[PDB]
Write an enzyme that holds these catalytic residues in place. Structure first.
Site, PDB file in Angstrom:
ATOM      1  N   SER A  31      -2.704  -3.227  -6.904  1.00 19.89           N
ATOM      2  CA  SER A  31      -1.692  -3.097  -5.444  1.00 19.89           C
ATOM      3  C   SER A  31      -0.207  -2.616  -6.145  1.00 19.89           C
ATOM      4  O   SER A  31       0.303  -3.228  -6.548  1.00 19.89           O
ATOM      5  CB  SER A  31      -1.754  -4.549  -4.340  1.00 19.89           C
ATOM      6  OG  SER A  31      -0.627  -3.781  -4.055  1.00 19.89           O
ATOM      7  N   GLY A  32       0.036  -1.587  -5.192  1.00 24.06           N
ATOM      8  CA  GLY A  32       1.277  -1.175  -5.770  1.00 24.06           C
ATOM      9  C   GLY A  32       1.128   0.063  -7.228  1.00 24.06           C
ATOM     10  O   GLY A  32       1.737   1.069  -7.775  1.00 24.06           O
ATOM     11  N   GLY A  79      -5.922  -1.992  -2.985  1.00 24.06           N
ATOM     12  CA  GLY A  79      -6.133  -2.607  -4.714  1.00 24.06           C
ATOM     13  C   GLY A  79      -5.885  -3.829  -4.894  1.00 24.06           C
ATOM     14  O   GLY A  79      -5.942  -4.836  -3.720  1.00 24.06           O
ATOM     15  N   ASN A 110       3.815  -4.225  -2.602  1.00 29.63           N
ATOM     16  CA  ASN A 110       4.439  -2.837  -2.599  1.00 29.63           C
ATOM     17  C   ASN A 110       5.000  -2.443  -1.499  1.00 29.63           C
ATOM     18  O   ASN A 110       4.117  -3.173  -0.357  1.00 29.63           O
ATOM     19  CB  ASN A 110       2.588  -2.747  -2.331  1.00 29.63           C
ATOM     20  CG  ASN A 110       2.533  -0.638  -2.461  1.00 29.63           C
ATOM     21  OD1 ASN A 110       3.783   0.195  -2.256  1.00 29.63           O
ATOM     22  ND2 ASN A 110       1.835   0.236  -2.162  1.00 29.63           N
ATOM     23  N   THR A 131      -2.608   5.597  -3.604  1.00 34.98           N
ATOM     24  CA  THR A 131      -2.361   5.849  -2.384  1.00 34.98           C
ATOM     25  C   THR A 131      -1.484   7.373  -2.325  1.00 34.98           C
ATOM     26  O   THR A 131      -1.728   8.436  -2.343  1.00 34.98           O
ATOM     27  CB  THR A 131      -1.353   5.152  -1.511  1.00 34.98           C
ATOM     28  OG1 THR A 131      -2.441   4.404  -1.037  1.00 34.98           O
ATOM     29  CG2 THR A 131      -1.183   6.140   0.158  1.00 34.98           C
ATOM     30  N   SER A 162       2.342  -1.203   1.183  1.00 31.48           N
ATOM     31  CA  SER A 162       0.656  -1.185   1.136  1.00 31.48           C
ATOM     32  C   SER A 162      -0.018  -0.941   2.006  1.00 31.48           C
ATOM     33  O   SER A 162       0.433  -0.725   3.160  1.00 31.48           O
ATOM     34  CB  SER A 162       0.997  -2.602   1.197  1.00 31.48           C
ATOM     35  OG  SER A 162      -0.302  -2.837   0.546  1.00 31.48           O
ATOM     36  N   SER A 163      -1.205   0.143   1.428  1.00 31.39           N
ATOM     37  CA  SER A 163      -2.065   0.237   2.535  1.00 31.39           C
ATOM     38  C   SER A 163      -3.360  -0.739   2.950  1.00 31.39           C
ATOM     39  O   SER A 163      -3.903  -1.739   1.710  1.00 31.39           O
ATOM     40  CB  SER A 163      -3.076   1.312   1.810  1.00 31.39           C
ATOM     41  OG  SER A 163      -2.983   2.479   0.793  1.00 31.39           O
ATOM     42  N   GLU A 195      -5.339  -7.958  -5.171  1.00 25.25           N
ATOM     43  CA  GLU A 195      -4.447  -8.740  -5.032  1.00 25.25           C
ATOM     44  C   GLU A 195      -4.494  -9.771  -5.115  1.00 25.25           C
ATOM     45  O   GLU A 195      -5.339 -10.619  -4.941  1.00 25.25           O
ATOM     46  CB  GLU A 195      -4.040  -8.146  -3.952  1.00 25.25           C
ATOM     47  CG  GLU A 195      -4.527  -7.860  -2.709  1.00 25.25           C
ATOM     48  CD  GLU A 195      -3.861  -7.258  -1.149  1.00 25.25           C
ATOM     49  OE1 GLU A 195      -3.079  -6.877  -1.142  1.00 25.25           O
ATOM     50  OE2 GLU A 195      -4.137  -8.470  -0.123  1.00 25.25           O
TER      51      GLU A 195
HETATM   52 MG   LIG Z   1      -2.155   2.639  -1.068  1.00 23.96          MG
END
Ligand SMILES: [Mg+2]
Length: 959
Positions: A152-153, A433, A208, A157, A211-212, A435
């Site tokens: 994550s981050g 991602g 993030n 993306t 974040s997605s 996490e």
């Molecule tokens: Mg993302």
């Protein structure tokens, strides 16, 4: 000299690894001196790591380092990163570190610089990776995929958007770019599709800010001419629970904030919007960053306008957003003497029903007292405040999810077009991602499972598929085990039966009448307690239910509301009402009704089951693609630029299997070529290796290799292809390009010499023809030749001279040496051609003088004879004899003056001899003398007609 410094890497707690001068060495221990502080240290020899010399500084491809170990990989990435060089190659894949600042490396000029370039020709970048996959698809006619791994981050993306930006720029057809500089419809939309999904599917998490909260696979469809014709979007597992609650320092979906902070007074009026603090579903009140929302909202509205969306479409979506929020403002209570849910205030349900196109009463009765179907009748059942509050939250989450699903369907309607995709596509995977939060729930388990599966896809592609291909081609190879296999974890999670996995244990538990989140935790600790990747909670320590040893770390899971989040229940009564809704959007989103109604295991698929099925579909799609991996690395956990944390980067490089992938590239053969393609490609390198018609691939390649004298250890002849070590083909392509230039130069320089030596022979012949018109023809030809045939050739002299110097400098090993064909000797023979040109034209001027000196002498000669021929023949009038007396004496007096004719014979013979004297001194056509002499003999004859008329005139006279 650098080697005399004795520099080595030693482990460091703070810096990961640090430079140290090797002081002394033993079989067990080693003494070093730290470079930074000068501190002496005794450590076991094993801990020492060999360091690369300074020529390997900021190396582009790490698979090229002499010493490949953790410390050198770390140092190469760190040095590159602190120079603002975030991309680095590592064998067949790419590593990227997120900078956490804006960098000037993604302009239209940098895009153009990557076009048609080879990976080694240009510095590491996402564009080169994109270009490689794009070129691979175009040549092999195979479906490609770009896979961004990372926690994550890390930058998945952001990198995905850069792939799309590259392809949309370099692979748009002449249609959709009718006018240069102006992007067309498809390009504009294709680029505005991600911001749209990010507004409805991204949120600020502690890891993030953007974040997605869903995964996505994007397919870009291309035409047989390699041009973009469409795109398709697949989304996976939206974190729909984020619509109803978020943790500390976290926000809901961004759209919520953009709408509430950015809408105009009339849009707040028409959609019944209220301040932020008024919404229960927005857990941490007001936006973390305000004001900027007016701007972001307007950008989302403009992006939606770029896509096909109508004004009624956009208004309907925002009304649905406000509707998801309004569900949370309904304050339910219980009755005074019963646990029945009541609704003392109905203002929020009045608002909710207006936004969802329903009846207030129908809604209220359906929510508070839902009718259930059993045995050919309908039973009205009471709901408690908790049951009813859960239904509200299930309905608001199911509505946000369905809005998102519709959003994707619509983007595919705009974006997806022209199904004449030419047997190809370029898939870009952008999953949520790995996490780890304070509380990890079902959502986290689902994300972490997908990250596990992608890492295993890297393991399978780099180490299993690579080695299986060598076995399949009969190559001498002994299997290498890199210890990268995630089957124990993947299996614990996803195994359907025999020992069922966590997801299957969850499925069975839920479909049990008396089952509770606690009984699931009990079942899973009993059944899975002994698995090496599962851990039971330790007394006095873990507040969590259980732990899973993921590849990227141990993650503690709290199973709160897992039976419900898996079974995904909804109220049947309210769902039916939403289906029968007056509103067009609500009805459209709510048109599919197949879910679990209030009520062997069953006939209903759980969230777990459905997601496992969807992930397997994605894996089978990826298995029929040639993948390109982008390993995104987060430098630190503080969202800080210019602050790489060594121990965090090392963990990531470790679980990712970055070094092992590099090692399988150095120890194996990463490049393969078919026998037919090798023979065709490098036949200029081995001209006499293959004779006549050989009619065979394996042997024809075997003779070419033998002729090339390639090191045995640089290649392996297989059953259908030749395998090479990294960089062997890249050097053969340069050797082939070298021979191609060497062949072209040799052909042209041989033809140039053949031409200049043939014309030199034409310039020095010294035979012009003996005619003024011939000597004029040679002057007319040479003047045209000087301005028609010469210039192109002279240019070839300057072109070949440049080519030779460029081919010389190009050789980075043996310089070309040819005979008589050096550019300096090309100059020396061309100077001799010009020296023959000057001596030809001058000999033409001398010739013209002489030829015209002869014509003057000839016309002077012929004029003289003509007058002589005329005078002697006009003298023929001597014949007449008809006279009387006194005429003869007068005639005899006129015949006397006529003896001054010798005065002519004196001048003429004096002129002809002078004409013929001037002639001799030059050239000769002396047939003339015979001619004049005969006229002199003809002149004597008439000299007898003088006496012939004198004696005939003589008469008896005086008698
Ligand atoms: Mg993302």
């Amino acid at each position: 000299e650098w080697t005399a410094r004795r520099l080595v890497w030693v482990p460091s707690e703070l810096h990961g690894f640090e430079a140290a001068a090797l002081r002394d060495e033993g079989e067990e221990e080693a003494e070093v001196e730290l470079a930074e502080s000068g501190r002496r240290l005794r450590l076991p020899r094993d801990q020492i790591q060999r360091m690369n010399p300074p020529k390997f500084s900021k190396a582009e491809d790490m698979a090229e380092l002499t010493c490949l170990n953790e410390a050198s990989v770390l140092h190469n990435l760190r040095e590159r990163y602190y120079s603002g060089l975030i991309y680095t190659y590592s064998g067949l894949f790419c590593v990227v570190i997120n900078p956490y600042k804006q960098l000037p490396i993604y302009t239209e000029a940098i895009v153009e610089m990557y076009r048609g370039k080879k990976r080694h020709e240009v510095p590491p970048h996402v564009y080169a990776v994109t270009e490689g996959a794009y070129r691979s698809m175009l040549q092999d006619r195979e479906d490609q995929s770009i896979l961004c791994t990372g926690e994550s981050g890390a930058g998945k993306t952001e990198n995905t958007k850069k792939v799309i930006q590259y392809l949309a720029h370099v692979a748009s057809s002449p249609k959709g770019r009718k006018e240069p500089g102006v992007p067309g419809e498809l390009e504009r939309q294709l680029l505005q599709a991600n911001p749209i999904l990010e507004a409805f599917g991204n949120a600020k998490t502690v890891k993030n800010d953007n974040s997605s909260r869903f995964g996505k696979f994007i397919r870009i469809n291309f035409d047989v001419a390699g041009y973009i014709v469409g795109a398709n979007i697949e989304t996976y597992l939206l974190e729909k629970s984020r619509a109803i609650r978020q943790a500390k320092d976290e926000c809901s979906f961004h759209i919520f904030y953009q709408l509430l902070g950015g809408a105009g007074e009339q849009l707040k009026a028409d959609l019944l919007l209220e301040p932020c603090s008024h919404y229960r579903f927005l857990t941490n009140g007001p936006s973390s960053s305000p004001g900027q929302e007016r701007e972001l909202f307007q950008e989302t509205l403009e992006s939606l306008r770029v896509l096909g969306f109508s004004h009624e479409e956009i208004i309907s979506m925002l009304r649905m957003v406000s509707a998801v929020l309004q569900f949370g403002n309904i304050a339910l209570k219980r009755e005074r003497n019963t646990d029945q849910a009541t609704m003392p205030d109905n203002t929020a349900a009045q608002k909710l029903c207006r936004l969802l196109g329903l009846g207030v009463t129908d809604f209220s009765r359906a929510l508070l007292t839902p009718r259930i179907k059993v045995g050919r009748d309908y039973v009205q059942k009471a709901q408690t405040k908790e049951q009813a509050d859960f239904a509200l939250e299930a309905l608001a989450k199911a509505t946000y999810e369905r809005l998102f699903r519709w959003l994707v369907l619509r983007l595919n309607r705009a974006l997806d077009r022209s199904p004449r995709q030419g047997a190809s596509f370029l898939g870009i995977l952008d999953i949520a991602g790995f996490e780890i939060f304070q509380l990890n729930s079902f959502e986290q388990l689902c994300i972490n499972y997908t990250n596990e599966k992608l890492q295993q896809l890297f393991n399978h592609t780099m180490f299993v598929l690579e080695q299986e291909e060598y076995q399949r081609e009969g190559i001498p190879w002994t299997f290498l085990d890199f210890g990268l296999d995630l089957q124990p974890c993947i299996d614990l999670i996803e195994r359907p039966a025999n020992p069922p996995g966590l997801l299957a244990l969850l499925d069975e538990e839920c479909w049990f009448p008396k089952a509770t989140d606690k009984s699931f935790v009990e079942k899973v600790a009993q059944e899975q307690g002994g698995h090496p990747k599962f851990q039971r909670p330790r007394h006095l320590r873990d507040q969590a239910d259980f732990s899973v040893l993921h590849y990227a770390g141990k993650v503690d899971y709290k199973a709160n509301e897992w039976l419900m989040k898996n079974m995904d229940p909804l109220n049947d009564n309210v769902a039916a009402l939403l289906h029968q809704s007056t509103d067009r959007l609500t009805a459209e989103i709510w048109k599919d009704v197949e879910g679990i109604v209030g009520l062997r295991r069953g006939m209903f698929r759980t969230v777990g089951q459905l997601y496992k099925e969807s992930l397997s579909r994605l894996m089978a799609t990826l298995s029929n693609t040639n993948p390109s991996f982008v390993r995104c690395i987060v430098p630190n956990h503080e969202k800080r630029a210019g602050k790489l944390e060594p121990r965090l980067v090392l963990d990531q490089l470790r679980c990712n299997g970055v070094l092992e992938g590099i090692r399988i590239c150095r120890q194996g053969f990463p490049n393969r070529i078919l026998f037919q393609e090798f023979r065709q490609r490098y036949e200029i390198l081995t001209p006499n290796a293959i004779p006549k018609g050989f009619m065979d691939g394996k042997q024809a390649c075997e003779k070419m290799i033998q002729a090339l004298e390639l090191d045995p250890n640089l290649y392996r002849v297989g059953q259908s292809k030749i395998f090479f070590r990294a960089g062997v083909l890249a050097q053969l392509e340069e050797e082939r390009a070298s021979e191609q230039t060497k062949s072209d130069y040799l052909k042209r320089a041989n033809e140039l010499v053949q031409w200049i030596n043939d014309k030199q022979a034409s310039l020095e012949s010294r035979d012009f023809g003996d005619s003024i018109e011939s000597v004029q023809s040679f002057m007319n030809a040479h003047k045209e030749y000087k301005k028609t045939e010469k210039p192109p050739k002279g240019q070839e002299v300057s072109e070949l001279e440049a080519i030779y110097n460029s081919l010389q400098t190009k050789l980075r090993e043996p310089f070309v040496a040819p005979a008589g064909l050096t550019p300096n000797e090309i100059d020396s023979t061309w100077s001799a051609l010009e020296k023959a040109e000057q001596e030809h034209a001058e000999a033409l001027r001398i010739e013209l003088k002489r030829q015209k000196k002869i014509a003057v002498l000839l016309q002077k000669y012929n004029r003289i004879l003509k007058k002589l021929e005329n005078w002697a023949t006009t003298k023929s009038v001597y014949l007449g004899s008809n006279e009387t007396g006194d005429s003869i004496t007068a005639v005899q007096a006129k015949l006397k003056n006529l003896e001054a004719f010798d005065g002519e014979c004196q001048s003429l013979e004096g002129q002809s001899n002078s004409d013929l004297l001037s002639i001799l001194a030059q050239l000769t056509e002396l047939n003339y003398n015979g001619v004049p002499e005969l006229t002199e003999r003809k002149d004597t004859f008439f000299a007898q007609q003088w006496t012939g008329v004198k004696s005939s005139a003589e008469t008896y006279k005086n008698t």
